[PDB]
Amino acid sequence: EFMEPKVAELKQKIEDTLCPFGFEVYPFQVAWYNELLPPAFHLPLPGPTLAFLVLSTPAMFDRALKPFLQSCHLRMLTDPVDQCVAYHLGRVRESLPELQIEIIADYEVHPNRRPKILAQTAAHVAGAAYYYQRQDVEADPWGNQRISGVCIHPRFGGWFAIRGVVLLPGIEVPDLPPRKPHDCVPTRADRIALLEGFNFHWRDWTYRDAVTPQERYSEEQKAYFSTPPAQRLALLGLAQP
Numbered sequence: 001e002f003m004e005p006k007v008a009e010l011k012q013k014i015e016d017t018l019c020p021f022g023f024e025v026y027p028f029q030v031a032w033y034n035e036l037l038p039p040a041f042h043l044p045l046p047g048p049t050l051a052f053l054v055l056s057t058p059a060m061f062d063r064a065l066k067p068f069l070q071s072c073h074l075r076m077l078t079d080p081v082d083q084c085v086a087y088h089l090g091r092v093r094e095s096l097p098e099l100q101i102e103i104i105a106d107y108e109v110h111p112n113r114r115p116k117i118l119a120q121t122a123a124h125v126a127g128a129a130y131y132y133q134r135q136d137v138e139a140d141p142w143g144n145q146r147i148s149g150v151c152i153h154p155r156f157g158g159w160f161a162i163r164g165v166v167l168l169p170g171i172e173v174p175d176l177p178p179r180k181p182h183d184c185v186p187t188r189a190d191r192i193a194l195l196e197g198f199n200f201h202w203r204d205w206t207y208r209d210a211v212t213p214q215e216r217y218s219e220e221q222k223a224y225f226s227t228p229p230a231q232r233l234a235l236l237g238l239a240q241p
């Protein structure tokens with residue numbers, strides 16, 4: 001009846017399940033996501049439907065991936081981190097058994113090769129990380145190249161990843177208050193440098209420092225993500241109990 005207490009209760013339940021393992025949780029309305037998108041990407045839910053954007057902080061690697069590797073057998077052709085994230089998104093269901101919930105991870109792609117969710121658009125409208133796009137630089141320098149956008153977290157910079165959306169059909173919060181993402185890379189020259197670093201130099205990691213981060217990925221975590229996905233899956237499978 002009154003949704004404000006309901007949103008807080010649901011958020012707290014999801015945070016209790018996910019925050020100990022290195023995730024953060026942000027509510028948004030489905031309408032805010034659909035509003036920005038062409039119909040191919042629309043979530044076919046009523047606009048006031050409550051959703052949650054899930055991202056991983058640097059701590060996810062130690063708090064979730066490492067214990068996961070000790071307890072679960074790795075499947076082929078799926079990155080270990082994606083298997084870990086699928087496991088933890090699955091725990092959200094166990095934590096709300098009396099609700100119909102729908103979960104779409106960042107790694108999910110349609111047979112037509114479109115991603116099932118636009119993770120960066122969800123992160124922006126959930127107020128979690130400003131999504132910096134080519135059109136945020138007027139008269140940008142890149143011409144007729146594809147230039148991908150990039151989200152920057154106000155606490156972690158680019159040292160984070162977007163992991164999924166949790167949708168709660170039937171739970172409608174038309175008055176959920178919009179929380180705008182922090183424009184933490186405001187200047188033109190910094191926006192150009194960020195987009196250049198992400199698009200053409202992302203293997204040197206430096207785009208993630210576009211704001212000073214409270215924490216970075218550990219050198220061990222950086223070793224993992226620096227390793228080609230085929231090799232890291234082969235090596236972790238080799239060493240598993």
Ligand code: CNC
Pocket residue numbers: 036037038105106107108115116117118119120121124125131133148149150151152158160161162163198199202225
């Ligand atoms: C496919 C994909 C994806 N990738 Co890559 C990965 N892995 N990626 C790739 C590949 C191609 C990317 C591409 N084609 O653009 C490749 C090339 C495989 C790749 C590579 C990388 N990726 C990388 C990363 C980190 C990420 N990738 C994701 C973007 C990550 C995605 C995860 C996900 N599920 O979203 C991902 C699965 C889908 C991205 C996509 O297709 N978007 C392109 C297009 C469809 O979206 P768009 O450009 O934003 O356009 C929409 C918006 O503009 C929106 N819109 C319109 N008006 C507005 C107004 C506003 C205000 C807003 C907010 C939106 C809009 O509408 C448009 C659609 O019509 C990421 C969000 C995944 C994650 N966090 O788990 C993450 C970025 C995180 C961040 N800080 O933003 C890499 C560094 C490698 C890595 N470590 O994984 C590297 C970076 C180079 C690069 N060029 O991106």
